[PDB]
Structure formats: structure tokens, C-alpha cells
From a paper:
Here we elucidate the molecular basis of high-affinity phosphite and hypophosphite acquisition by determining the ligand-binding affinity and structure of the PBPs of phosphite and hypophosphite ABC transporters from environmental microorganisms. We over-produced and purified PBPs of three putative phosphite transporters; PtxB from the globally important marine diazotroph Trichodesmium erythraeum IMS101 (Te_PtxB), PhnD from the oceanic picocyanobacteria Prochlorococcus marinus MIT9301 (Pm_PhnD)35 and PtxB from the soil bacterium Pseudomonas stutzeri WM88 (Ps_PtxB), as well as a PBP from a putative hypophosphite transporter, HtxB, also from P. stutzeri WM88 (HtxB)18. The structures reveal that ligand specificity, measured here by thermophoresis, arises from a combination of steric considerations and the interaction between a ligand P-H hydrogen atom and an aromatic π system in the binding pocket.
To determine the structural mechanism of phosphite selectivity we co-crystallised Te_PtxB and Pm_PhnD with phosphite resulting in high-resolution structures (1.95 and 1.46 Å respectively) of the closed, ligand-bound complexes. 1d, e and 2e, f). In Te_PtxB, it is not possible to determine the protonation state of the phosphite from the pattern of hydrogen bonding, but given the pH of the crystallisation experiment (pH 4.2), it is also likely that the mono-anionic form of phosphite is bound (phosphite pKa 1.5, 6.739). Both proteins contain a conserved histidine as one of the phosphite ligands (Te_PtxB; H160 and Pm_PhnD; H158), which could help stabilise the negative charge on the phosphite. However, in Te_PtxB, one imidazole nitrogen atom acts as a hydrogen bond acceptor to a mainchain N-H (S178), suggesting that the histidine is neutral. In both structures, the hydrogen atom at the R1 position of the phosphite points towards lobe 1, packing against the face of the aromatic ring of a tyrosine residue (Te_PtxB; Y208, Pm_PhnD; Y206). This tyrosine sidechain forms a cap that is stabilised by intramolecular hydrogen bonds to residues on lobe 1 (Te_PtxB; D22, Pm_PhnD; D13 and N176), which in the closed conformation, contributes to the network of interactions that connect both lobes of the protein and bury the binding pocket from solvent.
Author numbering: 10 to 262
The structure:
Amino acid sequence: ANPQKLVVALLPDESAATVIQNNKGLEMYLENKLNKDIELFVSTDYSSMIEVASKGRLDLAYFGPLSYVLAKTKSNIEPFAALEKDGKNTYQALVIGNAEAGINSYEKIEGKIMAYGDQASTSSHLIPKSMLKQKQLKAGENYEEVFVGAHDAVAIAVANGKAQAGGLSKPIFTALIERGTIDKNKVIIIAESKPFPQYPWTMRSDLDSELKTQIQQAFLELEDKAILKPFKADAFTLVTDQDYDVVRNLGEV
């Protein structure tokens, strides 16, 4: 209940060095506020994060929405905060196409290779897959799916031409363009999803009351631009479990 050190896991939605480096600023702030030491953990894939969480081995975990839903079925954890941008607490998936191949509509996806990220990804699997299904594209019926493991790997493949289309997170696509990792004109945005709730920061439920409240507070109070720059976020807001029922519903269907 009162750990001297805090194990903090971060979703491997991109390469580990990108993820680690994005949260370094936030790690330092949380050391100063909680007066505790933090070791970051970035798993090899989303499923191994979910496993590590299900051992009671993590103190905090920054999960994606679907991965949170899956981890919560077998882990004693509690969502408490999520990024806010422009007083909004949500985010979008994109469907993108390879521009050389002229992949600029849903109809051009038919009979081609569609890149997804991790199988437990919300915005690089579940969401883009539902968007494709609403448009009568079904995996292994009228197109071929490949799982390339991460959002940055999706962007890379689609821009390369190894895949003709892909599904990934709109903020990650945006960061990738701004950092120069991907050339913008090699990819065409086909569609954007509806709003889904942002990734939940979660904590272990059997943590001490006063520590749980201190952690939540630390997030809610954070205001400086430099620390949130790698997420293009103005703040954190609070979230609860029920906010993820929209994701469960889509996961059910």
C-alpha cells in the first residue's frame, strides 16, 4: 500500500526511446511532487503490459483505452486521469493510404494490404477496423491485414508502400509529421474516426488512500508547457472506469 519506489509502465504505442523521452519531463515532476523514486517500464508489446499489470507488479500504468479495458478484466487497477487538449478529453484514429499507389478512398483499399498496429490497440486496430467494416471492407474477405506492432511502424509501412493503407492514432501521426519521421506527401488521409476517450493513466487500487489522492492531485495540478509539449496537451483531467464503456461496446461488437 505504501511503496517506497513507484513502478510506472508506459504503453509501447511507438518505439521505446520515443515513449521514454516523451515522459522524462513528467517523470521528474512526479518525483518532485510525490517525493518518491520512479522507474519507467516500457513493455515489448501491449499484451505483455497487460500481463505485467495482472501480476500486481505495476504501481502506475499509462494504458490505451482498449488495453485498459483488457487489463481491467484481470487486474486490480483504477483509471484516474487523461490528457486534455483545447478543453477536450478525446482523440481520433485515422485511416491513411499510400499516396504513390493513389490510395485515396475506401474503394482503393479493396484487395490491398491494410496495416494495423498491436492487436490490442484502440486507434491502430479496433477503431480503424470498425471504420473499414462500416464501408464493407472485412479482413481476410476483401483485403489483407498485417500487424506491424506500433503506430510509428504503421505510418512507416504505409508511407514506404509495404502496406497500401493503415490505421493509427491521429496525435501520433501528427507528432510523426512534425518530428520529420514521416514525409507528409507520401501518405493521404482517407478518413477520421469519431471521438474516443483519451488514454487512461491508471493506478493500483490497493495503494494507500492518501497516496492515491496525492497521485491524482499531482496530475490534476500539472500546468507547464514544456512537460506536456510531447503530447501537445494543455492539462490532465479526471476520468473514471465508466468513461471507457464506449470502448467496451465497440470491443463487444
